[PDB]
Swiss-Prot record:
Residues 1-129 form the C-type lysozyme domain. This is Lysozyme C. InterPro entries: Glyco_hydro_22, Glyco_hydro_22_CS, Glyco_hydro_22_lys, Lysozyme-like_dom_sf. The active site is at residues 35, 52. The gene is LYZ. Monomer. It comes from Gallus gallus (Chicken).
Amino acid sequence: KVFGRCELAAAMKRHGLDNYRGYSLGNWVCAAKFESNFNTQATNRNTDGSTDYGILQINSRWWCNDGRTPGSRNLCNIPCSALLSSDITASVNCAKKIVSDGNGMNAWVAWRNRCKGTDVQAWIRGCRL
Ligand code: NA
């Protein structure tokens, strides 16, 4: 599924991401835009052989099991395929653990590089929330 901007903002809010660990909803929408272009099916291989999955490009190195990432963990206790569902529940639940891990949203390098410090509220402008 490719979400609409305000459709994803609504789903993230429903799943309790809005101001989770102090990150306003526009931060999460901005991160999703640059990680996945709002596509739940997005996958990208990393140079280290790990893979990033779903709207928030969660990495098999630590967070999910894909069976092909040697020496990795599965700290969200999920198959990485769950992160590609049209239902964002598994991505949101796993993103809450990641953003709690100590470095906040810096875990998402595209958030640090393209969202951090910007006018992230623009990402939820005009949305009925
Ligand atoms: Na893994």
